[PDB]
Amino acid sequence: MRAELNQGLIDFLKASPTPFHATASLARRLEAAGYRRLDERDAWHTETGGRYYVTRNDSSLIAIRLGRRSPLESGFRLVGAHTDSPCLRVKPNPEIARNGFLQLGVEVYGGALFAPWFDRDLSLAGRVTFRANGKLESRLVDFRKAIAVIPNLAIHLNRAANEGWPINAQNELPPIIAQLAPGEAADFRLLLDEQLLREHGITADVVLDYELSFYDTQSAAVVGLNDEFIAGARLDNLLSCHAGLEALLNAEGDENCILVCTDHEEVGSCSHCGADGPFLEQVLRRLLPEGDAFSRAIQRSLLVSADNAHGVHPNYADRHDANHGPALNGGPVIKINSNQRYATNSETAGFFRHLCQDSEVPVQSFVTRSDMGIGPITASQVGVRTVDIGLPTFAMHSIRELAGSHDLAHLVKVLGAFYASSELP
Amino acid sequence: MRAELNQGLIDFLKASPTPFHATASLARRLEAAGYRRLDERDAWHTETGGRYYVTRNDSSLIAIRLGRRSPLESGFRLVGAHTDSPCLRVKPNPEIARNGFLQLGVEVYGGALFAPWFDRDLSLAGRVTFRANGKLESRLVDFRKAIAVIPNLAIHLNRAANEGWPINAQNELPPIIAQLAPGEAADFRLLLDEQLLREHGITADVVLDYELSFYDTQSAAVVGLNDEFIAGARLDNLLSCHAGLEALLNAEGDENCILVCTDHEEVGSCSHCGADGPFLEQVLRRLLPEGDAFSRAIQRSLLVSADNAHGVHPNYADRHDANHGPALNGGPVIKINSNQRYATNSETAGFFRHLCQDSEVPVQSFVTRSDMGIGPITASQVGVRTVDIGLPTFAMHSIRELAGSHDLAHLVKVLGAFYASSELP
Amino acid sequence: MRAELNQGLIDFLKASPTPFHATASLARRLEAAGYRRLDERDAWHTETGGRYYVTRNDSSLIAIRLGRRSPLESGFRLVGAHTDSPCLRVKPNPEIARNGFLQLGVEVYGGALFAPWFDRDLSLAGRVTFRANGKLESRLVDFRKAIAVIPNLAIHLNRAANEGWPINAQNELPPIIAQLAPGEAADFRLLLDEQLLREHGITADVVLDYELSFYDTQSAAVVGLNDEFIAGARLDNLLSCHAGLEALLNAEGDENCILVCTDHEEVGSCSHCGADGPFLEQVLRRLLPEGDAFSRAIQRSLLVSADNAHGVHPNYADRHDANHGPALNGGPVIKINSNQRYATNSETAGFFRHLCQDSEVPVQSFVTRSDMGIGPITASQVGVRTVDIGLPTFAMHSIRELAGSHDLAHLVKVLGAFYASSELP
Ligand SMILES: [Zn+2]
Ligand SMILES: [Zn+2]
Ligand SMILES: [Zn+2]
Ligand SMILES: [Zn+2]
Ligand SMILES: [Zn+2]
Ligand SMILES: [Zn+2]
Predict the structure, then answer these.
(1) Cβ contact C255:C422 at 8 Å
(2) Which domains does chain B have, with CATH numbers?
(3) How far, in Å, from the CA of B163 to the mean position of ligand 3?
(4) For residue C172, which residues of chain B lie inside 8 Å, CB to CB?
């Protein structure tokens, strides 16, 4: 059922307010399915038929199904996605006290659209690092309830509001979380300490640092007269993580299947744990002999880089090429850009397109208007052929994005077919 | 003879309208010379004196001559160039039907100069991926004849034409290829199917995707009162591919010689097969033992990165530094930029400059005016010392560029000397 | 069929790089067909059925075919065209010596589109006036070989090239023709002396002055998927000179036919040499008695003023009126402009429109958009009724223009019908 898949997506989104939580949610499903967690510090002893996963920074995840045939001779079938989404992150000395409020200073992470973050019931989640019994450790928190808001200024006090103004992030985006009594101090670290106790039963000696993201408490939901759509934060790109996961868990065949979901894509993938890092490469090498084996394996592999595409928006149709306007619910989009903003080529495109035909999934094509500006990055790190595809969406980088409610099922089906395909060379 | 070299260049350019064709043309000369093609999927068994080449994506080529002394102890002598040039590529849903014409929608690939593409007799070539007997495959096509034109608008309907306007690529660059009868449909994929039959005797079940570049049907030619010049598309950087090839095929000595010609340079080299990919590195490692051997070899190696330079243009001389204006026919230019836009340093510069002196080839120096903005990329991928050099040219990224007709011979001679040089450390 | 007419057009364009050469090429054809050259200094003795031509400045030509009925009683059937085209012409003290090159200073003749002149393999042709054996004389030269180039500046040194800039003709248009040795003197007049020896076996005492045009060495060619098009320099207006000639030479009937091809149309006419000089009037008067004859004859005459029109361009279709967008290969266009930018009227239009219908040639209508800005000149000299017609083309005043490959035949057919037409309005 599309309906079961879509509900599964809504659940996953709800459990995944930050890249740490997305990674943990992926890990829980994998383990329930029998996948064994490996640690990058240990020597591994994997084998044919094994089901494994590994993480790095608790925010990037690689899932591995080793097939019957070795990667050396049959290659890997890889699906790539990303765990991060543009949002607001709490600063390290964040307490702002003004006009009787307590606010938290925020950085903008990734290319967020600012306006939609206003007038939303926000909570806060992510990683907290602390010392307990002279031991340094980390946990995830999620306050869950709506503790914050970034309100708009009344139109009465900003009469040209609808003219547009340059929203200044330093000044306009700090959320209000509380009011302070006369002479009441404010200690955010103390609030985190309370949350650690409440959520984990832990008392910290001291809260040191954290990576906390504001997020919307409004769950994702089906929308539309005929339930055509799905609305929710983080569709870019938890939509693809979830699809890629369902495809891996249900895939037939006995190929070598990889699900790589990396952090830091919204920011250029350049970290210890991003796609422009050697995470993927160092995991794959561990599944092969030394020498030429990795190079040979990779030239028999294909990466399907799954990241949301732009549907043609009816109130802004002129932002698309008239020949390449994807329809929501018209299936996955093959993304082409010969300037290598996407890595797709005629062979990767052709293979995917054929795969969609054999699976009876509709498929679409996108290029940008020629007067407008992980695929290329991972191709360039490990050298693997890549097709960039995505489900068509609107309002990418909003706090609440829109996709087609038929498209997840289309994508799970074709990814399932990819992962089961014994042929690529 | 300069004359034979220049004719060889004109032939090579004609056979090489796309990076796929350039790669194929290089491969045909190599094979005629006894070089054996290796496939990156196979285990290799190479040996001293062997002559090999390999390709990736059918658009990047590495040619290898293994010397008598091992690369571990004598290093590699590498010449780098690139197979791609700025141009117009057909979009994936390209048919535009308007005012009785059929046009093809185009992306701009690389930093093309738009104006010169107008009012030229264009053909179309590149890779087509298709299914024939339930098998997926690729071929090259080249329509050869002049089937397309991007006409200017009459000056009468654009009286300030000579004032300059911003040429909009989405709207102004689609070429006209035909006129359509009343109610005649247009299927580009069908035209490709016919071309596959005509050119290869193949009937496709279905044409899926393609990477097709428009190109100029006017051959390259000697020009000038005393035949001082050569004019042609793709001098950047088929000029260097060709030179590098002739130098490899004729080189004396018994050093380890590499010719690396990569795709996607005009776009940042960031692909499976570009210089910012691991193609080169993974090939070189296959020629050495495991362990420290590759690192040691590379620190005994030198990359001569050959890509066209800017001659000082007499109608725009103030775009050069007055002290660093290279003359066409004044020999190769050593390109310096301490901000690492070029990787040359005093040692790589000095070695090259000396090499030119011992070969009796004139040599020049270029830096940019200090108020203006593969070498650095490959140095940074494999860690190899690099000198960036180029033959001086005009009108780079036009459809028709200009070089000096004495300079190819100068460059072949010095590259020959580099490839035969037994000393670098 | 008339692949014949098109090949003849290509040959004529190739032999006619300047107005002087176009006039010579017209004359050689007319003589081959039996037409006798008269000289304007002599008294003429012409007669019924006579075939004559005359020139002025060696750059304007009038061909005369006298019918059986006198002009007085049956009028003249005139077709008008022009021998000149916008181009670049050598200055009288042209040598520019800079950064080791020799360039030639140029004037812009007519309303040339500058950009397309760049990055083209140019030769040089025209009239040289010199002294030999103490006497003054003129010959035409054509170097033929591609001796010159006006290169673009690299996009790397002009990074907003595609945004447009105002091309300065004084600075950016001088062609490079050579490189000079240190201390080597440049003498253009000496180069002309050598060309005179080489091409005519003449040695000059002194080369005095010249009128030389740069031109493109790439021949005109058929282009397009189904050979729909013809591309070439000088379609405006050698396309009409050629059509008129063919019609005159093949026309049936008995009428007095005139072909008038004048120089200097692209600059307003207004030389000794036409069309609002008195060349045409002074030749026509000499075919009639004194008195009221000329005036009477001219009121029974019609001038078909043939000069290229603008087809509707699909990448710039808003530059036409939506009701008046001529199609290439749609036949001759009747040009209408109430402000007398064209002299067409309801009677001259209707007659031409009827002629097309009876010849089974398709015919089109053009007016400009009412918000945007030769026939009128010659009607206003002489007083003759005039229909302004033209074949539809693109990119007019480029170095390489485009016409329909069917339209020349269409035009020759109707001009032949015009010339054989015994009555007019
Ligand atoms: Zn994304
Ligand atoms: Zn994103
Ligand atoms: Zn280059
Ligand atoms: Zn380039
Ligand atoms: Zn004209
Ligand atoms: Zn004109």
Answers:
(1) yes
(2) 1-85+219-425 (3.40.630.10), 86-218 (2.30.250.10)
(3) 29
(4) 315-316
